[PDB]
């Protein structure tokens, strides 16, 4: 039944950017929807908002660009796969931003609110009165992951507008996550996560000295790995019950600070000791499935 707020064994994995970067390393989204251990998948990425742009690496080969927006894709296989994964009990979020989002956000709260309403009309419930293009057709995402990586002006107003629309919606629960890097405070999404309630924060504990590679096994005195800082922040955040996922690279090619073996088991045992801990996040599906035995290491570490 997808995201489980009462579990310490949630696993969120990104799909779409083919980090492993080979012809065969990223199968279609539904290939990965028979994995009992992966209950949340983030589709990466809507890497342009105003104007809209979608990039799904070589999954774009089975999409058709919209005639009036060549950077926006119509993706019938992703549409079908979202519906299949949802039928299979997976929570499917759309990830906004990524390291290729260059638009810098919005100059006004009004522009940010309009942009949020466009994203909601494009990926939320189908709107009968709307002319907006729908990359995933009649599929409806289960929410949004905020993975902005650079200065995004008025991201707080964008997020608050999108949260307003999901809070007003019928049908199903919509989830909000954010993917800050572990450096505290986070420059890209810090203002957003201090203003807008999130269901969980999936912290990138990699590409930075505060990452899992900096964890010191055998002690609960941690000079580098800063989960404790994030837990302290969580308790007074807009959702004081917000959960944290420990985000890690799924292979040595996925990011700096890949860990495995006893370092991996130890940092997860340490993190599991905290009331906010809800499981793991991984970048990304292509790397995870190429890295034989790594998923079993992560599953075994969360037990
Ligand atoms: C606080 C601070 O500024 N820290 C600096 C680091 O940010 C910086 O390294 C960069 O870190 C970000 C965050 O970890 C990283 O982007 C994420 O992580 C992966 C890579 O590990 C990215 O993956 C790429 O995504 C694109 C699509 O946008 C693909 O084209 C490509 O295949 C991916 N590459 C790989 C190898 O997987 C994601 O976009 C993003 N993930 C999420 C959840 O948003 C950047 O890639 C890092 N940049 C560089 C140049 O390494 C670090 C080094 O510059 O310095 C810190 O100080």
Numbering used by the authors: 19 to 321
Which text from the study accompanies this structure?
To further investigate the substrate binding mode and to provide a platform for rational mutant design, we determined the crystal structure of the inactive double-mutant D165A/E167A with the substrate NAG4. The inactivated double-mutant D165A/E167A was also crystallized and used for soaking experiments with a series of chito-oligosaccharides (COS); however, only NAG4 was captured at the Chit33 active site, although a cocrystallization technique was also attempted with NAG3, NAG5 and NAG6. A clear electron density is observed for the tetrasaccharide, spanning subsites −2, −1, +1 and +2. All the subsites are highly defined though a large number of polar interactions that tightly fix the sugar. At subsite −1, the boat sugar conformation postulated for the bound substrate in a state previous to oxazinium intermediate formation was crystallographically trapped. Previous structural and kinetic studies on hevamine proposed the combined action of Asp125 and Tyr183 (Asp165 and Tyr224 in Chit33) in positioning the carbonyl oxygen of the N-acetyl group at position −1 near to the C1 atom, which would stabilize the positively charged transient intermediate during substrate-assisted nucleophilic attack. In our study, although we succeeded in trapping the distorted boat conformation of the substrate at subsite −1, these hydrogen-bonding interactions are lost in our double D165A/E167A mutant, which results in a flip of the N-acetyl group that locates its oxygen carbonyl away from the C1 atom. Structural comparison of the wild type and the complex with NAG4 Chit33 does not show significant differences, apart from a visible reorganization of the Asp117 and Arg274 side chains that approach the substrate, enabling direct polar links. In summary, the major structural trait of the Chit33 binding site is the presence of the non-conserved residues Asp117 and Arg274, which act as a clamp that may fix the bent conformation of the substrate that occupies the full catalytic groove, conversely to that reported in hevamine. Nevertheless, it is remarkable that we failed to trap the Chit33-NAG6 complex—an issue that can be explained by looking to the crystal packing, which shows that the non-reducing positions of the active site are blocked by the small loop following α8 (Ala187-Lys192) from a symmetry-related molecule.
The endo-chitinase Chit33 from T. harzianum is included in the GH18 family. Chit33 belongs to class III (plant-type) enzymes characterized by the presence of shallow catalytic tunnels and open substrate-binding grooves. Chit33 is folded into a (β/α)8 barrel domain, similarly to family 18 chitinases. The DxDxEx conserved catalytic motif is located at the end of strand β4 of the barrel, with Glu167 being the catalytic acid protonating the glycosidic bond and Asp165 playing a key role in assisting the acetamido group in its nucleophilic attack and stabilizing the developing positive charge on the oxazolinium ion.
